[PDB]
């Protein structure tokens, strides 16, 4: 049964987890979910690749968190960035404090 078991690992579950922390009583069609996986996926590369670009310009090799900030700064439009730029500078200092 482990034969055709080549996994198609997706964010879908994590997305439903999140689907609840603001709208805890909501359904979402598996086709409307298929979109949300194409979302974060898109958002992943976009930012990553930019932070990947942001290396060599500076003759860099280690992607530090910084170039992610910048990536997103460069990436995300107006007000909508501010929050994100914040949201992530948050969690970083939490895990700094954490184990």
């Amino acid at each position: 049964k482990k034969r055709r078991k080549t996994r198609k690992e997706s964010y879908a579950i994590y997305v439903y987890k999140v689907l609840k922390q603001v709208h805890p009583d909501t359904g979402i069609s598996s086709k409307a979910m298929s979109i949300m996986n194409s979302f974060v996926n898109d958002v992943f590369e976009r930012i990553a690749g930019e932070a990947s670009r942001l290396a060599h310009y500076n003759k860099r090799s280690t992607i530090t968190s910084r170039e992610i900030q910048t990536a997103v700064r460069l990436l995300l439009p107006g007000e909508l960035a501010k929050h994100a730029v914040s949201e992530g500078t948050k969690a970083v200092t939490k895990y700094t404090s954490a184990k």
């Binding site: 198609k8 997706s10 086709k31 298929s34 996986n37 194409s38 996926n41 898109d42």
Partner: protein, 79 residues
């Protein structure tokens, strides 16, 4: 009929979604003759991936990348 097998009312149907009130007679061909380029260009890019992975079937992944690199990126098939 293939390309002519694309219906004048279907041409109208899609146009209406763009908010087209009035459709001139010529449009019907032009629409087809603008839909063609789109496809040629799209599929060209698509199959080129097929022909790399060594495949006789145009996968879904074959397309996403076509439309992505085309610049007309699509959502909800990459699974």
């Amino acid at each position: 009929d293939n390309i002519q097998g694309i219906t004048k009312p279907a041409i109208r149907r899609l146009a209406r979604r763009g908010g087209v009130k009035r459709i001139s007679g010529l449009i019907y061909e032009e629409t087809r003759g603008v839909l063609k380029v789109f496809l040629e260009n799209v599929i060209r890019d698509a199959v080129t991936y097929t022909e790399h992975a060594k495949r006789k079937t145009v996968t879904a992944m074959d397309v996403v990348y076509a439309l992505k690199r085309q610049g007309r990126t699509l959502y909800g098939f990459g699974g």
